[PDB]
């Protein structure tokens, strides 16, 4: 089957494993990238997540590259950290 989980270079339509990252207080994509791929806040309701379920399988819809502009932020990353936000819907 084409249903295998992507691990890098995420593209629209990829199947991704979305996991709770307690240290960063957010859902992230499982990845071998050193960069954080956070789940976009808009995607939580349709994945039956809440702002917790440990993992869900999603389909990538959109990817956005971001940078922390303050030292205290919701992603628990230092000032200047770059990261992605990914919109995804349920794989099923």
């Amino acid at each position: 089957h084409s249903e295998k989980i992507a691990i890098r270079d995420f593209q629209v339509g990829d199947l991704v494993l979305i996991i709770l990252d307690e240290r960063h207080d957010n859902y992230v994509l499982f990845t071998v990238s050193p960069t954080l791929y956070f789940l976009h806040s808009e995607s939580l309701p349709a994945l039956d997540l809440k702002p917790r379920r440990p993992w869900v399988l999603g389909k990538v819809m959109e990817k956005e590259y971001c940078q922390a502009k303050k030292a205290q932020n919701r992603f628990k990353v230092p000032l200047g950290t770059k990261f992605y936000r990914v919109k995804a819907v349920s794989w099923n």
Partner: peptide
């Protein structure tokens, strides 16, 4: 929110 982070 836009204070904390931005798209780059």
């Amino acid at each position: 929110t836009s204070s904390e982070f931005e798209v780059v």
